Design a protein around this nucleic acid. Structure first.
Lengths: 44, 271
RNA sequence: CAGUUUGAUAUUGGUGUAUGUCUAACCUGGGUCCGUGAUCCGGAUCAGGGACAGUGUCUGAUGGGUAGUU
RNA sequence: AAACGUGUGCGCCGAUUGACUAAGGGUUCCUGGGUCAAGCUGAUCUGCCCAGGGUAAGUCGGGACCUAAGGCGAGGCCGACAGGCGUAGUCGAUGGACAACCGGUUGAUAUUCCGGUACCCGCGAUGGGGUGACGCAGGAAGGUAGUCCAGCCCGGGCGGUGGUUGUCCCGGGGUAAGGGUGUAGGCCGUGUGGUAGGCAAAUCCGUCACACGCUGAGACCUGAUGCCGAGAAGUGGAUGAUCCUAUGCUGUCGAGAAAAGCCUCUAGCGGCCCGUACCCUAAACCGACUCAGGUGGUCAGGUAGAGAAUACCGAGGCGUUCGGGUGAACUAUGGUUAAGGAACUCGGCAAAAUGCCCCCGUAACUUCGGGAGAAGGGGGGCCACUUCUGGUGAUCACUCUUGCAGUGUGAGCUGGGGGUGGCCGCAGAGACCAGCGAGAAGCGACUGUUUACUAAAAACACAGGUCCGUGCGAAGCCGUAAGGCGAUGUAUACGGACUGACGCCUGCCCGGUGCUGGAACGUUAAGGGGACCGGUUAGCUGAGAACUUAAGCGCCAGUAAACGGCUAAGGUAGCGAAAUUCCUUGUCGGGUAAGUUCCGACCUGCACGAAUGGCGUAACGACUUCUCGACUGUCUCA
RNA sequence: GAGGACCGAACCCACCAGGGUUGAAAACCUGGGGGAUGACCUGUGGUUAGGGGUGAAAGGCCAAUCAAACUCCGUGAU
């Protein structure tokens, strides 16, 4: 039937986007703790 | 009046609808309409705080003049009587002799073409607006201000009527539609006559859909729920709750007016 | 324990016979004006309420609404 | 070389196995080369590997224009900190405003390039006013796109086999945006004066007194001496839309965005950025797969048919993605079965049977709508003659207001209806498609919702009923607070609780618990008070009684459509072996040859009962139970 | 020419049966079946978050997981 992942780039940048991560201080820790861990793609 | 639907489908049987003989125009006055979107019973945090609301037909809000304080001595004519989805009583469009247009609640007996005037010199006829100090004792009024210039608060729905019982100094005794007797400052304004469309309460909606159009969503009984959801829930088979009736949040039945509330000293007799 | 609630006390004053009255603290989600293009906010100014209410500390009552467990 | 290419044939899809678009994918598109990895076999082929190439915009979609739900938010409010809310503003299309069509071309792009002809951008406000500006349903009319036919026009052909120079056969009978014109349809009073209102003004809007043209499908011309076309003709008629007139018209209640833009009033030679390939009912997206699943929107031909169903076909596409044989048992999907016809079984589960249009006819009961397509019965093909009747509209005249008119006239074309006779077959709704019907009981009034992935129900909901709370900064609810919803609502309104259409009704109990009201009096915390008794050598200091006080509780009344019960009162009305009855397969009657089930009664109610409603109820039900007719491989029995 | 009207495709759903059950599919296929102008279905954009949301109420749903989601941490819990 209908699976649980219908891709939509707009709605995936307004939910996990970098701009959204920088808005809440709880989200800027996620960004920083990914920079320290060394990941390449730092935010969706 | 009320028109009874011929029983022709299972849903329509036993229903009725307002006959709308009163209204003279079907469209509103463009300059006096404002946008209005349904809230769905959810406050600024997005959570439902009022249950059983939302999904109704789209509506637009008519700007009504509940104050009627700045047109003293200016006559007006009742141009039309119109339907209002926002409230039970009809609304009447006034053409003031100075050229301005406004809406008011439709008092009983107000008909198209009637002349009505505000201010202390207005005659005591349905539609006129006066300060309580100028209305004879024993008159029936509606749309009563609570504070000087505060706008109409009381007796605003269909068929509501308030009887002025006495005037004592700077206060006036009012018999509210609920039967409560209350003191009100004698400078508050009120309109003569009782609100019209008194047959509204006799309408039988007939089918579940007709309420849904009004925006009333289904109401679920507690005794059908589970104990986690409602205090009455649970039990095998049908139960009456197993406890003294309470709201879903555990509050018992009982009087909830704040006993220290300031307005008590304006209350002569409760309903 | 949250919540609801009682009293004392601080904010809290004048004046008369537990209870009146006054205005000045305090409250108006009352009117009008300005910042100002502005239903938020603040400052004016009239209109009221008024040492009451709200709030802090202390205190009795209720408290499966919630929480920890037998 | 079964699979790669070309040709022929055959079959399949065709409201899609065709042609596009958004989302998504991200080079899978084209050329050339390869066959090691991948392809559920194979490969010279590939959506695979390597190299190279390919996406052209003033007019298409979006940005530089507007705003909705909502987000962020200068100051700001609130909050121990973190942080929550929010004003001015600023973002945010799924909507509004805004200028291009036809044809050709490459291997890969085309409303983007090319050809032709077009179009838009380069005094007056941000303030006022008008407009923008709006639901749902329904029919009719006028048109067009498309389609069909033709004895007509143009181009071909004379039939491998009986006949085909003939109302015989095959193929084609087009052309857009823009401009000119202004029809059918729809809408609309003009002007003078005064003018408390539109934050200032207004000659504009509104209000008062007085006197008395706009838009618009389409037809025609131009665009077009062009382009297209089997380089000819490029006409006429019929039919006809889900498309246009139409944001129209009529009806109706549930009463149906904002801003920009445009108009008006006063105050005072250039034309930018992103997308443009390719897939898109799928072999390129979501499902781990080249997955029998899912995926919004547009295009929509012929014959039969009411139809976008269904059968065969068109435009166009596919037959590649393991094959070749062989009558084993057995399994699955289809098919037919003599005589019997539910005897199978928990149960008619499954299958069978009915099935279409027209006409006749239709019961109990009923809330008068219904039941009802009740049940049941008749006609159905083709040919000829005959009879009646729509639409269209040339020609013929006449009339005007002299036109894109009108009114008579009826050729040709084309629906529809009724009789008479005849012909063929086993069969005329001949294929595909296409209701089984009846009687009774239980529950729920009804349409609906529900346990995504074993329960669709008698469960939830519902319209209706009662009770309780709320006087507006309402009650209730989210939040520590601010602030919000309730509500731009106001006792005929809102919230909470139970019952659940409709009809007749809803009995007794306030002793318990809860709720409402009253508090004389008893008890009672903090606080006030500090009697009196101690330590030390009047002072300091420890413990500290009497007395003073509120809620609450004890107490007094009411309240059961409050939780509850039937001494506080002991079950009324109604029903009753029941969705309840153990004993129990109670007893009697009916149904059957035989009835632990079913229907009607009795009443010994283990253990019914009145809004956790009692008793009934027309209609309804993929609900449960019993019976009967039709029908059948369910069964004898395969 | 009204209707939470009737029959019936698209669309939504899932009552019955058979198949599938290391399936073509971690819920589908075939034939019947219900609604099919409304309390309807659907696209795009928003929004409600864990003792919390939402719920025509099944403890249902909240990313194949729900009588309290998932991830990291206390943590090498017991």
């Amino acid at each position: 039937s209908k699976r649980t992942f219908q891709p939509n780039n707009r709605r995936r940048a307004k939910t996990h986007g970098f701009r959204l991560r920088m808005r809440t201080r709880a989200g800027r820790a996620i960004l920083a703790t990914r920079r320290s861990k060394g990941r390449a793609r730092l935010s969706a | 009046g009320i028109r009874k639907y011929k029983p022709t489908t299972p849903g329509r049987r036993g229903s009725s609808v307002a006959d709308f003989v009163e209204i003279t125009r079907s469209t509103p006055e463009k300059s006096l309409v404002r946008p209005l979107h349904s809230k769905g019973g959810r406050n600024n945090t997005g959570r439902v705080t009022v249950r059983h609301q939302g999904g109704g037909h789209k509506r637009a809000y008519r700007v009504i003049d509940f104050r009627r304080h700045d047109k003293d001595g200016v006559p007006a004519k009742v141009a039309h009587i119109e339907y209002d989805p926002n409230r039970t009583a009809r609304i009447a469009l006034l053409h003031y002799a100075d050229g301005e247009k406004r809406y008011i609640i439709a008092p009983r007996g107000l008909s198209q073409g009637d002349r009505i005037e505000n201010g202390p010199g207005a005659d005591i006829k349905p539609g006129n607006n006066l300060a309580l100090r100028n209305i004879p004792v024993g008159t029936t009024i509606h749309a009563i201000e609570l504070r000087p210039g505060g706008g109409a608060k009381f007796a605003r729905s269909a068929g509501a009527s308030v009887q002025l019982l006495a005037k004592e100094g700077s206060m006036a005794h009012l018999r509210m539609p609920s039967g409560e007797i209350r003191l009100v400052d004698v400078r508050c304004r009120a309109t003569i006559g009782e609100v019209g469309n008194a047959e509204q309460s006799n309408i039988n909606w007939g089918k579940a859909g007709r309420k849904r159009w009004l925006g009333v969503r289904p109401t679920v009984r507690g005794v059908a729920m589970n104990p986690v959801d409602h205090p009455h829930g649970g039990g095998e088979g049908k139960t009456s709750g197993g406890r003294h009736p309470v709201s879903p949040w555990g509050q018992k039945e009982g009087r909830t007016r704040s006993p220290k509330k300031a307005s008590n000293k304006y209350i002569v007799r409760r309903r």
